[PDB]
Amino acid sequence: DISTLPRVKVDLVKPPFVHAHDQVAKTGPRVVEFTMTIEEKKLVIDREGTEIHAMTFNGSVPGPLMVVHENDYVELRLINPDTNTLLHNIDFHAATGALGGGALTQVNPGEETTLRFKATKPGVFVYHCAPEGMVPWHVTSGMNGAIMVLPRDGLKDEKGQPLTYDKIYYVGEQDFYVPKDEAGNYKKYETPGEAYEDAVKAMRTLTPTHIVFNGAVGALTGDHALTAAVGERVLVVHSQANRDTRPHLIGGHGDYVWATGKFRNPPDLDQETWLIPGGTAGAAFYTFRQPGVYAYVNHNLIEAFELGAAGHFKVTGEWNDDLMTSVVKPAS
Amino acid sequence: DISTLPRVKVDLVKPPFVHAHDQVAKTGPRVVEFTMTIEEKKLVIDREGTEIHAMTFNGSVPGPLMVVHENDYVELRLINPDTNTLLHNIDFHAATGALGGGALTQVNPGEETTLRFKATKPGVFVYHCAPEGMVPWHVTSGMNGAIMVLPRDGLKDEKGQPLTYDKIYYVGEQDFYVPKDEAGNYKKYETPGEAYEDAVKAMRTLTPTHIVFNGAVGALTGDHALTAAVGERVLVVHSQANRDTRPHLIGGHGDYVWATGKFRNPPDLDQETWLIPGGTAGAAFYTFRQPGVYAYVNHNLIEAFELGAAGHFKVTGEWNDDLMTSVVKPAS
């Protein structure tokens, strides 16, 4: 009887940050209530000033990470205000039945809907918009995110001992296919609707024009770099709703990786680089051991350094010469 | 002494269906006899009426699934009738030596051959044609299939308890590279031989024009949708002889997945999406929990919804509101 369960309202935060939650569950099953507002907006995605009409959950690319526990109920109020132009919906890969909720969540501009589902399987899972006949266009315009369903006793290593993270970040990787004129310049449109047939032709090439973390080239750099301290345990959740990726932390490793993101399986250990298939979210746990700048990249290095799939960590603390040292500095 | 073993003749069925077999072996080792006839035929692969000269085992794309048990002998009579034009052969990834049988099975039009091999390793494995110097052309013209070698005591979960499927389906995914004129229209040829150099140029782009299940856009939809009932245990075998794929059941999961298809390994649990590398067959076990339409897609959604890698399941039975429900239907 769901009416006797506690309800809790969560306010979502912008990626790469994640709303507050408990790793080990301090209550029994709950109905966890979320609200999301669809926003169609103009987004500038690179240094050149290239602009797309992005389709977003809650104003961001990716949409926010939702965090619940196994056997919680998720109740999502989804709002499509009348300032938008398109029909949208939501498919949760975490959910069972009705096209992951897609069949029950079709909202025209001006409409809302509330969907509930039980989170029966632990792991990180993609969610994405998927309207009949326009599925890839919505997804590759930025309309995807992820949900983490933690086991009620938190994460476990390959032996079954607890793993506790001190910080968690969410990296949404987005493949864009900006249409081009005959000469290779990116085209501009006044509405999302105008671009439809050119977007289809751009997608059919299977060649993205940009691949970005958190919605833009350089989004996770400078003042927006991810931060940590030597000795901190960091969980990085990474999703790609449409195309394969191969994350790598330059200067580090994935100590424990769930590459396909499902926590009933034991993690892979000591990974240099791991494959997250398109349509999947994965999770990597790392304990930082050296201070400095680290780059976190898709290790197709063309995709990383030319197309934009690179961000930075800035890590504070003490340098350990036993792990690494320059014996003779560069010289004649 | 193979002469003292029982022989059994199996008649193959068209995909996505699979010939009858026992999961747990009810006899000792056998010589299981199969026959396949190579057919070159004109195939229409999309709604636009685009036609290719397909090269098939037994008239279908994919070729039929063969099912044996570990330590059976497979004996394959392969017939290339004189109405064909090309030399063909067969490489079984399940087999050991002679290029998977490829070196011993070269048949000109008018010839047959009989190959025997011992199925020493359990799993689902690709088979494909592979004639010297024309390997990708044959494979990407549809000349591939799969064989399942069951452990003699059937399938096991990650703990080692039996897993029993009520139904089994075989999904062959095929990347095609239809050559195009200067303007982007698909070219037409009277024979397979005519297309050779244009096919090579189309392949070298690494960009397929179509990606289909069971030989055509929409082949596993409408009246040809896969069927099941709530509470049935379904095994889906999926192969791709040439290009990576990432299957996903929309509205469901892969409860137990052997992504690289080899049953001595424990399955991966609770998968949303899994990667089957090109040149591999994989297997996913699911128990249906909700009725309705499910889409089974390659979750590069461009490949799925624009290039054709999508099919449907229609599932009958009772709807479970505890797993999912619409709390407030779409409205103002």
Place this chain on the structure above:
Amino acid sequence: DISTLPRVKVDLVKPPFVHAHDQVAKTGPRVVEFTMTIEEKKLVIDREGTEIHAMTFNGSVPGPLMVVHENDYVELRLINPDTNTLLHNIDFHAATGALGGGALTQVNPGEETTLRFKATKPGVFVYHCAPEGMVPWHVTSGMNGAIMVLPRDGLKDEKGQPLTYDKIYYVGEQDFYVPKDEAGNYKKYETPGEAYEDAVKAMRTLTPTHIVFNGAVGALTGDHALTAAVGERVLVVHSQANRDTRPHLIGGHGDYVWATGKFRNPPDLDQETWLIPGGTAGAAFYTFRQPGVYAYVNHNLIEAFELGAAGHFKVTGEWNDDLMTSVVKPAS
């Protein structure tokens, strides 16, 4: 105190061969000293005589495999002689901190540097050049290799029993992006520097013009085929610094595979084909059971047979008819 540890000087050998080493460690931790000299050179990569300006460690593509044990220190003297033109460095994915050593190893032509790091994690790992702002150009010009960090007690199977290899080979797979004129002919340059902007444009296509083992189309064939004897245990280390690959031994299997190359994890068994993600090294163990020619391919067969990702093994010994036999040779 590193000053009390034994030092040992190793001389590197050209791939596909590997310097001598012990599987099970016969000493305690050591500082293992290597030297590498960067060479920029003109390389012919195909039968047509297409030439690139390759950037190499020690004159080869890939660079040589370095082999140490877990908790050894690696000390690398890296020399950029003044006959080169570019700035280079080295990132070891095996190492912790400073961008895998990249931040500390920047050497102009005329300079050297010596870097030390502790090999804390067992597995096969990529190393590659990664100079600020020119990372993919260096990597895709051939400037990558691998290091194997063996557990001190050698390799173990999934149950934990020893696995001992009789031979080891290293296959570096290289994606090249040779720039093309308007008509599709490959362009030629007098220096590496001249090509820079055309190379960037070629890379941005995400479509390699060639994919090769050991630096050229046909490099591991004929007189340069890999050799083995029936009953030998062979370890094949395989790396790809930039793009996903899916190795397959035609006529054989991967009996034990570490697809993502990290030995604290149990191997995958009985693989037909496995995915090594770009930015990763993997390892496959096989025991040969039949004599003859075997092809070792990337099983995107276009990439293999049209773009060049294929080599051969020649295996000597006795033919086993129980595993495979031609019952009726090709005939009318």
